[PDB]
RNA sequence: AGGGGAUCGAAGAUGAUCAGAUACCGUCGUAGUCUUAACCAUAAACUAUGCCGACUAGGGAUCGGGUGGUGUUUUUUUAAUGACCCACUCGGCACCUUACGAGAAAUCAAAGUCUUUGGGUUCUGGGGGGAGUAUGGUCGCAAGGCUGAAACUUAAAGGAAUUG
RNA sequence: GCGGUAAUUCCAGCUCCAAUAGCGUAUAUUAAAGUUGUUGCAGUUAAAAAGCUCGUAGUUGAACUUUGGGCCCGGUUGGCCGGUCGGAUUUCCAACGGGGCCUUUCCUUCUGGCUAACCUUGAGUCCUUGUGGCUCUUGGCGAACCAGGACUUUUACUUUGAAAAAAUUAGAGUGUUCAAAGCAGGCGUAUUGCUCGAAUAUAUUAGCAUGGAAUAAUAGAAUAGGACG
RNA sequence: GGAUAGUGGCCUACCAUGGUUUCAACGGGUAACGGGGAAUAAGGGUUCGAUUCCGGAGAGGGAGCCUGAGAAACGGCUACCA
């Protein structure tokens, strides 16, 4: 959200649901920020290093929190099968 | 409208100053006068061919066409030698930013050269006041009928 | 829809993508077009023919094998009825309903049913009349209507 | 739900759906080469007769009409083409 | 009976954007619907749509993304007059700086701004944001 | 769409349907029926001069109690006869019968003022002077 | 206007009750109640909720139709049947739970997809009282139906919910 | 809503507020009013869905027909440079529009008048090793519109333009001392004159003129009474 | 055909049966001259225009006419009414 000459005006470029890309806002004390763990060679799980996803309060409310997560973490590589594009 | 007779009046019908000297033996009997009214309307040969008199014929009469050229669907053919078209049109009501159907019934004189039936689209031309109401004249028939000879009987 | 009730019955033919074919169908255009007219003359409505040819014969849809609706096949063979068959089957009904009401003035429900039917009739004709298949003046009439079907 | 392939639905969920409410709607009746061994030459029948089909030569019978599919009479075989 | 095939297509889209979805199946397609769905993706308010060819009138499948708040249609396709196009955008677009009234002109179905550079006019179809 | 036809060509319906429902518009009707010119004591005018018949003492409406001193007036232009209030303390001694008062409204569009029942007019001047003036004492009532 | 007139029973007459008691309770019982021929056209004629089309969400029942099964039961010799079971699918009458949503709320899968305000269309309402009154027209044998004002008056009337 | 004996509402005194050469009051209308609702209401219970269904006028009404690709011409903003003594244009770049082509493709149509344009070419060349460039007659462009014949399915919408009164409105110029105004005025050799002005826009529903060919109608070849010849 | 400056049911004679209408004819109301405009300022609107410019009608109500290029004139006439 620029300005006349360059200059990033207006505070706060808010988050964004990964499922729906609708805006995660402030009084949305209902949404979520899942951090999955970046593992390495044999079980060990590299702390402080994540793959993350943010889901709107709305999606979680409509119950779609699980299924949509599945698809997200799988076509991001941390699920093999489970999910299916067809139905 | 006319048809038949031609000389069916108390008065003798004839074109003004279109003399035929009987002394001079002829094969057409009556010399006839016609004109091309202009503006791109063929003067149908049934004006030239014909025998009707009609002093209000735009092709064989003393009326002249000028001013508005209008078109309308023929809606009534019940008066001798003059019909009444209905020109319709949508009218804009600006508070509502929408239109409504209105119409007018312009009465117009029609020359024997044309045969018109009800429904035909016509093209009229303005002329001098010809009667109490008619200020236009049939100048071209656009349609024909309504595919009438293809509404007939059984196989 | 359901133009004279609160019926909402989705119910139809689900007709092939295969706008030609069927390949397992031998025969010929000759064959059916002939076969069509045999029943035409034997006195059948294009509907009954389409139905008979669909079961006994392998005529999936008579157009797909002769690019021609049956009523067109019939018309072009001078075997086409006075008035359209749906208008006919309509009128026919309104008659038999009427003959019921003659014998039973006491049946207001028939009255009601009759109205509905004729109002379908009346509106149908207006179509057929508009599109030139019935003379610009054709009318249905209780008086004459019964003689009109038989 | 929330995201799926409307374009490539499964062979089984496209299966159970109504005949009009499928992806491209099509028929689901079939056709039959029907035999009653009294004959040699078999006749082609539509799965939902209406017209109780009679055989080629003999006025035998064949099938009888119902609500939907026809009931084929007694000792008969068939095929779907 | 079914009376503005376009207006239905926009509603479906809107209701799947609301319900948080990412694909709509729309019926029965139309030239216009495409040339509307075209402007939408041309300013990237939906993803890609596919025409499936029932031998009937059509089906489209819009994959969309959620950048869209509201596509909408103007039900009596009023006549707009070169200067009143500002007035339309005014009444129904969220801000001066984005989103288009898409409308119908003799020179193509086009967002109001393209309809400015080309300097044509015609009827009003729908809008997007 | 509930109600209104949305058609592009349905203007006639829409304008006429208006014309109609305007009649439930209270003052639109009054204005077209010419209620002003017809009923109502004043001609439609802002004021009217008339003449005093009797001095009256109207008891106030609840929950108020008093006696609200008025004049029955027979309007000149009109013949029509009207009761009207004589405002402020005293004033009713300025009036006397058969005098010529100028009436005016009460600013309620008809509709009697307050705890006064059915009086819709007030006095502004007697014998040509202004009631106000006389009250204060900037002026004195004329001859007879 | 006939026929019918068992039953219950507007009116009327009584017995009781009551300060009274033209009533409520009990008795008697006319018209009516039923039917034919013709009227009348009104009901809180109610879901107090227009019709057509689309879209948006979960669940178990059920009514009618149909598809599917090395289902159960009927036994005969297996079948055929018929009823029953389970999966589905249209289309019914509904109920359940939610509420993305809607509402002033009560509540509502429509009363939702509306200031992010436009699918098509019909009708009605515009403070309360005056008053469904006067009037005219029209329909009716009548009773009455439809259409249907104003003067004047008046600061509330009303709705849903909360606490008492 | 105050007043029935301590009146924050009356009658006054004091003090105070608002507007001020003006301020009150009556009546009307307009805004507030999304309480007339096209934009923009409401109708379960607040006012309000006809007992029901048919149905003419009226309003409304599914999808489908030249789409996609290639080439040419020259515009108007904008950038990176300025060549130049504030603004200039060529090469470079995008980006936004307009015109005309070839893709099986009426462009109404023949009969010359006419040509502005290249498939031309007749020479060669100012000059960057040349398709960078235009003057230039002798085979080969139609449409740019003349004018005469022969003919044209109907609309709606939309663009642009003519024709148009002034005052009024919006608005430029100008120091009526300001201003409401007005259309004046401004410069000198103020001794024999110099000179800027008296804009612009709106102007619509209809009519006319013209560019468009999406959206929405209308007409056509089915008893062939078809179409070109 | 007459009449007019002239078109025209303008009038007459003869002849026909037409013209308008839910897209509101016809009738009623108007405390109605029409327009340029005026008031209210989100827009869409609502209301208003007797009244400085244009057009129109009148000159107590009606009719009739002279003069003249031009009047159905009224600071012209003639009649009836008031
Ligand atoms: Mg006649
Ligand atoms: Mg219906
Ligand atoms: Mg349906
Ligand atoms: Mg069926
Ligand atoms: Mg009312
Ligand atoms: Mg008295
Ligand atoms: Mg008087
Ligand atoms: Mg009895
Ligand atoms: Mg009693
Ligand atoms: Mg007693
Ligand atoms: Mg009694
Ligand atoms: Mg009722
Ligand atoms: Mg009930
Ligand atoms: Mg459900
Ligand atoms: Mg079974
Ligand atoms: Mg009170
Ligand atoms: Mg004291
Ligand atoms: Mg005191
Ligand atoms: Mg004081
Ligand atoms: Mg003030
Ligand atoms: Mg609008
Ligand atoms: Mg309201
Ligand atoms: Mg109510
Ligand atoms: Mg109802
Ligand atoms: Mg009715
Ligand atoms: Mg369409
Ligand atoms: Mg213009
Ligand atoms: Mg000017
Ligand atoms: Mg007659
Ligand atoms: Mg009316
Ligand atoms: Mg007047
Ligand atoms: Mg005026
Ligand atoms: Mg006026
Ligand atoms: Mg006046
Ligand atoms: Mg004039
Ligand atoms: Mg005069
Ligand atoms: Mg008189
Ligand atoms: Mg005079
Ligand atoms: Mg004079
Ligand atoms: Zn057999």
PDB file of N, CA, C and O in Angstrom, chain A residues 24-55:
ATOM      1  N   UNK A  24      -6.843 -12.786   7.354  1.00  0.00           N
ATOM      2  CA  UNK A  24      -6.878 -13.040   8.790  1.00  0.00           C
ATOM      3  C   UNK A  24      -6.760 -11.711   9.517  1.00  0.00           C
ATOM      4  O   UNK A  24      -5.734 -11.045   9.439  1.00  0.00           O
ATOM      5  N   UNK A  25      -7.808 -11.304  10.212  1.00  0.00           N
ATOM      6  CA  UNK A  25      -7.778  -9.978  10.813  1.00  0.00           C
ATOM      7  C   UNK A  25      -7.523 -10.056  12.316  1.00  0.00           C
ATOM      8  O   UNK A  25      -7.141 -11.109  12.835  1.00  0.00           O
ATOM      9  N   UNK A  26      -7.722  -8.934  13.004  1.00  0.00           N
ATOM     10  CA  UNK A  26      -7.333  -8.808  14.403  1.00  0.00           C
ATOM     11  C   UNK A  26      -8.310  -9.449  15.388  1.00  0.00           C
ATOM     12  O   UNK A  26      -7.913 -10.322  16.159  1.00  0.00           O
ATOM     13  N   UNK A  27      -9.574  -9.027  15.388  1.00  0.00           N
ATOM     14  CA  UNK A  27     -10.488  -9.552  16.399  1.00  0.00           C
ATOM     15  C   UNK A  27     -10.880 -10.996  16.059  1.00  0.00           C
ATOM     16  O   UNK A  27     -11.523 -11.669  16.861  1.00  0.00           O
ATOM     17  N   UNK A  28     -10.461 -11.472  14.882  1.00  0.00           N
ATOM     18  CA  UNK A  28     -10.480 -12.905  14.574  1.00  0.00           C
ATOM     19  C   UNK A  28      -9.576 -13.620  15.574  1.00  0.00           C
ATOM     20  O   UNK A  28      -8.409 -13.949  15.293  1.00  0.00           O
ATOM     21  N   UNK A  29     -10.136 -13.845  16.756  1.00  0.00           N
ATOM     22  CA  UNK A  29      -9.476 -14.633  17.779  1.00  0.00           C
ATOM     23  C   UNK A  29      -9.999 -16.063  17.649  1.00  0.00           C
ATOM     24  O   UNK A  29     -10.418 -16.682  18.625  1.00  0.00           O
ATOM     25  N   UNK A  30      -9.972 -16.572  16.420  1.00  0.00           N
ATOM     26  CA  UNK A  30     -10.649 -17.814  16.086  1.00  0.00           C
ATOM     27  C   UNK A  30      -9.853 -18.600  15.066  1.00  0.00           C
ATOM     28  O   UNK A  30     -10.025 -19.809  14.932  1.00  0.00           O
ATOM     29  N   UNK A  31      -8.986 -17.901  14.343  1.00  0.00           N
ATOM     30  CA  UNK A  31      -8.155 -18.529  13.322  1.00  0.00           C
ATOM     31  C   UNK A  31      -7.001 -19.310  13.939  1.00  0.00           C
ATOM     32  O   UNK A  31      -6.992 -19.575  15.133  1.00  0.00           O
ATOM     33  N   UNK A  32      -6.006 -19.655  13.140  1.00  0.00           N
ATOM     34  CA  UNK A  32      -4.959 -20.531  13.643  1.00  0.00           C
ATOM     35  C   UNK A  32      -3.653 -20.403  12.851  1.00  0.00           C
ATOM     36  O   UNK A  32      -3.665 -20.009  11.686  1.00  0.00           O
ATOM     37  N   UNK A  33      -2.531 -20.705  13.506  1.00  0.00           N
ATOM     38  CA  UNK A  33      -1.228 -20.730  12.849  1.00  0.00           C
ATOM     39  C   UNK A  33      -0.469 -22.027  13.150  1.00  0.00           C
ATOM     40  O   UNK A  33       0.248 -22.124  14.149  1.00  0.00           O
ATOM     41  N   UNK A  34      -0.624 -23.022  12.283  1.00  0.00           N
ATOM     42  CA  UNK A  34       0.038 -24.305  12.483  1.00  0.00           C
ATOM     43  C   UNK A  34       1.486 -24.293  12.035  1.00  0.00           C
ATOM     44  O   UNK A  34       1.780 -23.993  10.878  1.00  0.00           O
ATOM     45  N   UNK A  35       2.396 -24.638  12.934  1.00  0.00           N
ATOM     46  CA  UNK A  35       3.768 -24.856  12.525  1.00  0.00           C
ATOM     47  C   UNK A  35       4.063 -26.349  12.521  1.00  0.00           C
ATOM     48  O   UNK A  35       3.991 -26.990  13.572  1.00  0.00           O
ATOM     49  N   UNK A  36       4.352 -26.904  11.341  1.00  0.00           N
ATOM     50  CA  UNK A  36       4.832 -28.288  11.245  1.00  0.00           C
ATOM     51  C   UNK A  36       6.358 -28.290  11.302  1.00  0.00           C
ATOM     52  O   UNK A  36       6.997 -27.309  10.925  1.00  0.00           O
ATOM     53  N   UNK A  37       6.951 -29.378  11.775  1.00  0.00           N
ATOM     54  CA  UNK A  37       8.384 -29.355  12.049  1.00  0.00           C
ATOM     55  C   UNK A  37       9.259 -29.853  10.892  1.00  0.00           C
ATOM     56  O   UNK A  37       9.030 -30.924  10.330  1.00  0.00           O
ATOM     57  N   UNK A  38      10.278 -29.074  10.547  1.00  0.00           N
ATOM     58  CA  UNK A  38      11.245 -29.528   9.568  1.00  0.00           C
ATOM     59  C   UNK A  38      12.128 -30.604  10.202  1.00  0.00           C
ATOM     60  O   UNK A  38      12.980 -30.285  11.021  1.00  0.00           O
ATOM     61  N   UNK A  39      11.927 -31.875   9.850  1.00  0.00           N
ATOM     62  CA  UNK A  39      12.756 -32.956  10.408  1.00  0.00           C
ATOM     63  C   UNK A  39      14.064 -33.117   9.634  1.00  0.00           C
ATOM     64  O   UNK A  39      14.296 -32.428   8.647  1.00  0.00           O
ATOM     65  N   UNK A  40      14.937 -34.008  10.082  1.00  0.00           N
ATOM     66  CA  UNK A  40      16.106 -34.343   9.261  1.00  0.00           C
ATOM     67  C   UNK A  40      16.461 -35.820   9.362  1.00  0.00           C
ATOM     68  O   UNK A  40      15.645 -36.642   9.787  1.00  0.00           O
ATOM     69  N   UNK A  41      17.700 -36.124   8.997  1.00  0.00           N
ATOM     70  CA  UNK A  41      18.154 -37.492   8.799  1.00  0.00           C
ATOM     71  C   UNK A  41      18.029 -38.317  10.081  1.00  0.00           C
ATOM     72  O   UNK A  41      18.863 -38.207  10.992  1.00  0.00           O
ATOM     73  N   UNK A  42      16.973 -39.139  10.106  1.00  0.00           N
ATOM     74  CA  UNK A  42      16.533 -39.964  11.242  1.00  0.00           C
ATOM     75  C   UNK A  42      15.833 -39.150  12.343  1.00  0.00           C
ATOM     76  O   UNK A  42      16.478 -38.546  13.205  1.00  0.00           O
ATOM     77  N   UNK A  43      14.504 -39.133  12.283  1.00  0.00           N
ATOM     78  CA  UNK A  43      13.665 -38.676  13.375  1.00  0.00           C
ATOM     79  C   UNK A  43      13.895 -37.277  13.910  1.00  0.00           C
ATOM     80  O   UNK A  43      12.933 -36.557  14.172  1.00  0.00           O
ATOM     81  N   UNK A  44      15.158 -36.897  14.087  1.00  0.00           N
ATOM     82  CA  UNK A  44      15.493 -35.617  14.708  1.00  0.00           C
ATOM     83  C   UNK A  44      14.773 -34.442  14.031  1.00  0.00           C
ATOM     84  O   UNK A  44      14.626 -34.395  12.810  1.00  0.00           O
ATOM     85  N   UNK A  45      14.303 -33.505  14.840  1.00  0.00           N
ATOM     86  CA  UNK A  45      13.369 -32.523  14.341  1.00  0.00           C
ATOM     87  C   UNK A  45      13.804 -31.077  14.536  1.00  0.00           C
ATOM     88  O   UNK A  45      13.102 -30.319  15.203  1.00  0.00           O
ATOM     89  N   UNK A  46      14.947 -30.719  13.940  1.00  0.00           N
ATOM     90  CA  UNK A  46      15.443 -29.334  13.788  1.00  0.00           C
ATOM     91  C   UNK A  46      14.624 -28.211  14.438  1.00  0.00           C
ATOM     92  O   UNK A  46      13.827 -27.553  13.762  1.00  0.00           O
ATOM     93  N   UNK A  47      14.799 -27.991  15.752  1.00  0.00           N
ATOM     94  CA  UNK A  47      13.946 -26.983  16.388  1.00  0.00           C
ATOM     95  C   UNK A  47      14.175 -25.588  15.823  1.00  0.00           C
ATOM     96  O   UNK A  47      15.247 -25.278  15.306  1.00  0.00           O
ATOM     97  N   UNK A  48      13.138 -24.764  15.896  1.00  0.00           N
ATOM     98  CA  UNK A  48      13.205 -23.416  15.374  1.00  0.00           C
ATOM     99  C   UNK A  48      13.128 -23.361  13.860  1.00  0.00           C
ATOM    100  O   UNK A  48      13.393 -22.324  13.256  1.00  0.00           O
ATOM    101  N   UNK A  49      12.748 -24.475  13.242  1.00  0.00           N
ATOM    102  CA  UNK A  49      12.676 -24.549  11.784  1.00  0.00           C
ATOM    103  C   UNK A  49      11.416 -25.301  11.348  1.00  0.00           C
ATOM    104  O   UNK A  49      11.252 -26.499  11.619  1.00  0.00           O
ATOM    105  N   UNK A  50      10.537 -24.578  10.656  1.00  0.00           N
ATOM    106  CA  UNK A  50       9.172 -25.025  10.440  1.00  0.00           C
ATOM    107  C   UNK A  50       8.748 -24.921   8.982  1.00  0.00           C
ATOM    108  O   UNK A  50       9.386 -24.224   8.190  1.00  0.00           O
ATOM    109  N   UNK A  51       7.685 -25.648   8.642  1.00  0.00           N
ATOM    110  CA  UNK A  51       6.826 -25.313   7.507  1.00  0.00           C
ATOM    111  C   UNK A  51       5.450 -24.952   8.086  1.00  0.00           C
ATOM    112  O   UNK A  51       4.879 -25.705   8.877  1.00  0.00           O
ATOM    113  N   UNK A  52       4.928 -23.789   7.723  1.00  0.00           N
ATOM    114  CA  UNK A  52       3.766 -23.269   8.429  1.00  0.00           C
ATOM    115  C   UNK A  52       2.555 -23.032   7.521  1.00  0.00           C
ATOM    116  O   UNK A  52       2.693 -22.886   6.308  1.00  0.00           O
ATOM    117  N   UNK A  53       1.366 -23.020   8.126  1.00  0.00           N
ATOM    118  CA  UNK A  53       0.105 -22.707   7.437  1.00  0.00           C
ATOM    119  C   UNK A  53      -0.858 -21.965   8.353  1.00  0.00           C
ATOM    120  O   UNK A  53      -1.021 -22.342   9.511  1.00  0.00           O
ATOM    121  N   UNK A  54      -1.506 -20.929   7.829  1.00  0.00           N
ATOM    122  CA  UNK A  54      -2.482 -20.166   8.614  1.00  0.00           C
ATOM    123  C   UNK A  54      -3.909 -20.311   8.067  1.00  0.00           C
ATOM    124  O   UNK A  54      -4.163 -20.074   6.889  1.00  0.00           O
ATOM    125  N   UNK A  55      -4.831 -20.703   8.938  1.00  0.00           N
ATOM    126  CA  UNK A  55      -6.184 -20.992   8.523  1.00  0.00           C
ATOM    127  C   UNK A  55      -7.142 -20.048   9.192  1.00  0.00           C
ATOM    128  O   UNK A  55      -7.098 -19.889  10.406  1.00  0.00           O
TER     129      UNK A  55
END
